[PDB]
Amino acid sequence: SKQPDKQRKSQRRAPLHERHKQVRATLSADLREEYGQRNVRVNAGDTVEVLRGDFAGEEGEVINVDLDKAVIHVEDVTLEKTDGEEVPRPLDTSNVRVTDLDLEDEKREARLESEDDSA
């Protein structure tokens, strides 16, 4: 709807299958040309480049994708705890760009290459 309360609400309360769209990220120039799409759902296999936060400029493999919190962990994009341990700093896919896809799954690859559908 046009009402802000309903918009945020339908986003926070969206069922799991509707949350994939909350972890989508724009594709690199090459990939957009290759699959005829502007973006895709970031997978734990993909490689990505950070374009906005304090880690803008870095690239790395996606190590985790959390649909519950709609965020992703990217290798080496971490924070140093008090005890010294190194933990990941969650990223919104909206500040990221996919530069390499993990197509180990026929379905995803098939979905990506089809035209009537987007992956």
Place this chain on the structure above:
Amino acid sequence: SKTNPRLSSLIADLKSAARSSGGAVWGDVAERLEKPRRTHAEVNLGRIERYAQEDETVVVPGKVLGSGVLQKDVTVAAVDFSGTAETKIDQVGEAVSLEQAIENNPEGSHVRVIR
């Protein structure tokens, strides 16, 4: 506190002429138009026909309405005329805006006020 910008300008123009030319009617008419709308003239043709005379411009400090019959060939000057009024008047004389009259007669001479 008039709302109509045209009525507001007509009043200003009426004062300009009364003060510049040797007209006392225009300033007089101005004063009446400044009064509340309910006091403005609402005259039918039957009244103009009864008290007007040719070559003497009839001045109505209000609006002219179409009831009655006008035969005399007179020039009626009013703030406004109803559609029918302006039609009947033009058939045997002429209907003019108070704005034109002020221009063709800034001195405001040979004029008869009717209400």
Place this chain on the structure above:
Amino acid sequence: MQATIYDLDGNTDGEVDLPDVFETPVRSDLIGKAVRAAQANRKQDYGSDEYAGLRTPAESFGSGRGQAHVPKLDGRARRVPQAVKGRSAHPPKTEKDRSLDLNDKERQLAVRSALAATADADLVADRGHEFDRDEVPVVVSDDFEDLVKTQEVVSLLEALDVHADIDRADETKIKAGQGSARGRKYRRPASILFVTSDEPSTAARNLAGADVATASEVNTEDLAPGGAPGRLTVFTESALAEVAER
């Protein structure tokens, strides 16, 4: 008077008689009234729950315990307007008539008057619109309706030295206040109004601040947004002629 017709390239292509209505004396008070009424007529009825604060058997103890005679329940004051959780004394009511009447003649006069304000460059410029043209409104060949791409309307407006107004409207304002909590965060200047004849211009409608309308039903509001007369308009060959009998 006469109005110059323009082709999709922006080049002059003849001219037609500007209909008499465009000579109607400009009446900003009547126009303002017409807009005021249209704006009020779309407002929704509202009001607080009629039993709000009244769902309690709270009673006053009267004199005797050194307390004010205020209805209380479980040692808590209630119901009365001065009580926290008490009823609203004179709240908004659903039964209230929030519409405004307007005689048809008076309304129609306003439309004609707003149409006429459209043919006065000085007024249009006073209203705020940006443009480097002398003749107004802008009249264009009926082929304008056949356009499809927004960008194609862009080219034409640039050719007509009128695109500057869209640049003006290409700035949204994030309003001060809580309207934002209700979906009214943004607002923006009103730019060009496109009046066609068969259907509203789908090609022009998305332009910043643009409004599209049809000659048979263009109203005081699109002709004078907010009640301010003199909107930079662009008519269609046939629109111009159709508008003549409004």
Place this chain on the structure above:
Amino acid sequence: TSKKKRQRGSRTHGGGSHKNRRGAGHRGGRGDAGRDKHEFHNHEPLGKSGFKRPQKVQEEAATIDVREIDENVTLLAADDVAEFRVDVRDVVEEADDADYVKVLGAGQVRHELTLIADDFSEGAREKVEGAGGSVELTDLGEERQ
């Protein structure tokens, strides 16, 4: 600024002592209470008067004064012009939901007219004839005797 808008801070909002604006006692009773006692003034007096005939035994005549007819003779070009001849029935409005048309004699008649109507008043005729005109009583008008 309206009167209402200036009341804040006044305490009594123009009511005088704050003991005045209470219930109906401040109005001497509700509605028309006391119309024969404390507030009898200017009230129509008590009592019955006259009677009414049944609504379907009542006749509502459609009337018109010669003045109206006569002032619009030329304009009524869509109506006979002889040595004017006018059937009032085709002139009077509301001449359908009326039981008949009657010509009244208010005003002057500066033309010779041949009027056709269900009924005329004495003065209506005196004037119409006196101006070189005539009056024709319709068939329905044949209810005088």
Place this chain on the structure above:
RNA sequence: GCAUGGCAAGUCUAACCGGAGUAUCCGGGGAGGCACAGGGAAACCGACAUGGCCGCAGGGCUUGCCCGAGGGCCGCCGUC
């Protein structure tokens, strides 16, 4: 009641119908209301688009003298 505004011997549409940019808005809809004649319980009858005199504003003139809307005092008319 009043102030403002539209139209004016008329004025306004109501429900509702069509259109559309779809609660806005454009067009249509005069059913009906109020006004355009009154008086009389009723039956029933049915009036000054001016006849006289004052005179404010305003206008005119040869600068007191004319014309004098509105207004004032009367006549006269309709009806009981």
Place this chain on the structure above:
RNA sequence: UAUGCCAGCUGGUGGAUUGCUCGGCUCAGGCGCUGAUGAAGGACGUGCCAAGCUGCGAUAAGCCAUGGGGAGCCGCACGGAGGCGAAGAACCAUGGAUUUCCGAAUGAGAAUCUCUAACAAUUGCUUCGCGCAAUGAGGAACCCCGAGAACUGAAACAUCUCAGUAUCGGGAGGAACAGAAAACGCAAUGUGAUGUCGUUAGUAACCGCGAGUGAACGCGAUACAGCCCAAACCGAAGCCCUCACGGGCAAUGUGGUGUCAGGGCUACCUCUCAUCAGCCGACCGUCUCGACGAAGUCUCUUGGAACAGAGCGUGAUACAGGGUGACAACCCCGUACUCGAGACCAGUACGACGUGCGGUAGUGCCAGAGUAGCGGGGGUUGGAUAUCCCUCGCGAAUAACGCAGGCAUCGACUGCGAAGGCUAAACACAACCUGAGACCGAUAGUGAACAAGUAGUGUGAACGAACGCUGCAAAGUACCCUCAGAAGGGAGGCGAAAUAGAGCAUGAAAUCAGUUGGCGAUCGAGCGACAGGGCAUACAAGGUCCCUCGACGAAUGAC
């Protein structure tokens, strides 16, 4: 200088203010019945660890199928351990499985359990056997049928009013109810079932003729639709159960005919497209859900972060709204366009099957009784003589008759056939779905943004709160010292900020601690206003002020 007064400063207390919105409020459109095939509701269970909420039911946050979906998942809820998922999980849609006990609660009983095969109870059919069936209870209001106040108004009060309102009893549906004239009565050569909306109209009518109460016909609209019996004349030509056999019903009449364009019958003309019954079966439209979906994440500067400024560029049938570390059409979800499905419209419209419309003449063959109507007594209504109903009593005609047209009777005239029945659409409500907003913005708005009908009160009926905000990211503070210490403190680490460190954005006043200026242990009380002195004062946002003399010099006015 104690006790102390006034103002401020630093820190607290407190949670105002500003900003924010997962909640309300209101409007609009759509939709709309559930239950003995055991509902709605409740109880008790159910998780690896599980108190609350949610889900579920001993198969217990779930089992199966088909389609969608997709590389993740194991609810709210970010734990530990562990597990599931390419044998395609999660999740979503549709259909199915499981579905404890109490509950209409139905074998009997009982505070959710127990005792010894159960439609308990009332009914219909009946194979007279619970064999086949029905009822019961629920639902926000809406709807129909009954029972029916008072405060109040009348400035008292009794008729009247509040009001056929509140509340009570019974009952149906998705809508109800009404409905094809014994009508109307703009009286007519006129209208033509019924709701409803606008108007007629605060009119007619009522009324301590007071206060007050208050229609209708008509008209303009919405939507439209008309039919079936009883009897005459026929007289078993019939219906129900069962696969069948067979059984039950039915002469106290099943079935045919017929239904005011009256009908039937006898004699004829012509003809059927009326009606009734059944078959088939939508378009469109509306509501919802879904698929697809353009174009920057370029430079410099500031910043913790660019969504800022400046510069360059792009889409737009898309510049609605939201999200993203700050003002985003072009980063993400969407949005426009186009497309798909379900629901409603509707088993309706259309089409087709069968039936057969209608007209003439004759015929006193048929046509609804405690009725029509009158009287006694009440209620009710605008209903006045002239509303509608109840009750007691009386009580008719038979179409060649009868009722109505606002007092009664009789004639005339006009209308119409009561005492049998059914009937779509247009209208009410808001539970449910979706959308919307000059509504409120956490003492507001719901009682309820939070454990909310929660905590809690009352024997019970019933009553009933308060509590929103760390941060961009938990990076949610490692190590050390102190201490009885997982407390607290100190030092330290993180972050732009810890004066963001847990009811953790901001942080008012009242007020408290410490402290600065002024006053202060010989002095008097609306706490001040106006003058004038002391003391005090970083900048900024005010820059004037003082003395000699001179110029001007009102009223007044000298030694």
